[PDB]
Amino acid sequence: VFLYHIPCDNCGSSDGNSLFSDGHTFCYVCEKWTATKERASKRKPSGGKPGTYNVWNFGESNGRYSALTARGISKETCQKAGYWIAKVDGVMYQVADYRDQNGNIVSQKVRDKDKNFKTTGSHKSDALFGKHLWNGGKKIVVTEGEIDMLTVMELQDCKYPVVSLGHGASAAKKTCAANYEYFDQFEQIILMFDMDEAGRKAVEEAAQVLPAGKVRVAVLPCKDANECHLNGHDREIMEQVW
Ligand SMILES: [Mg+2]
Ligand SMILES: [Mg+2]
Ligand SMILES: [Zn+2]
């Protein structure tokens, strides 16, 4: 992209040479096009949708990777999925770091005791908690919420593909749709969404936009994976996870 004019080191004009992102320039005068690469960087936009919250920094939020005892998830799991705790305004928050291919936090999903959702960074359509952890494979389990994603991980010793959905059950169709490209590196996709009216509707939807023939639907004797996990039903979670 065009950054701004620059004097030409060739023909010797003054402002007839334009500088782009590339790092390349073009001189209208002499008509030369060479591919400053530094200057160009120092001008790359970034940031996200105005109004949205800034990604919370672990080292500046009192963040610690504690274990969710009342959920059955350990620190070790939390630490691998990128799920941490923050103490702000004396209050407590749980943070789900949605990272990109290069482990760069892109967005975060923050919730508190009363269970109030808050977003940060650029929580795009393809938001998939855990996504950055698996380069394809045999199977991939897709829970509904980060904590369900977390549960399957506990039970599997964090050794196999599990991701969550960015904007809950509703976006189910769009998130999976938005992630069709991704989800197709695995031979299977275990849609393990909530075990209720709303959740069951989401599965209906997701299944639709997802790659035909690879889907699969989990059936838990509880509300959701963690619900089971807090009721010895790990058996049925494992039973449907392989
Ligand atoms: Mg739900
Ligand atoms: Mg739950
Ligand atoms: Zn020139």
Curated annotation (Swiss-Prot):
A zinc finger (C4-like) spans 8-30. Zn(2+) binds at residues 8, 11, 27, 30. Mg(2+) 2 binds at residue 224. Residues 138-225 form the Toprim domain. Mg(2+) 1 binds at residues 144, 194. Homohexamer. Assembles as a hexamer onto linear or circular ssDNA in the presence of ATP or dTTP. Present in a mixture of heptamers and hexamers in the absence of DNA. Interacts (via C-terminus) with the viral DNA polymerase that is bound to DNA; this interaction is essential to initiate leading-strand DNA synthesis. The priming complex consists of 2 DNA polymerases and 1 helicase-primase hexamer that assemble on the DNA template. Interacts with the single-stranded DNA-binding protein. The N-terminus zinc finger domain is essential for delivering the primed DNA template to the DNA polymerase. The central core domain contains the primase activity. The C-terminus region is responsible for the helicase activity and binds 1 Mg(2+)-dTTP. Belongs to the Teseptimavirus DNA helicase/primase family. ATP-dependent DNA helicase and primase essential for viral DNA replication and recombination. The helicase moves 5' -> 3' on the lagging strand template, unwinding the DNA duplex ahead of the leading strand polymerase at the replication fork and generating ssDNA for both leading and lagging strand synthesis. ATP or dTTP hydrolysis propels each helicase domain to translocate 2 nt per step sequentially along DNA. Mediates strand transfer when a joint molecule is available and participates in recombinational DNA repair through its role in strand exchange. This is DNA helicase/primase. The chain holds residues 10 to 255 of 566 of the full protein.
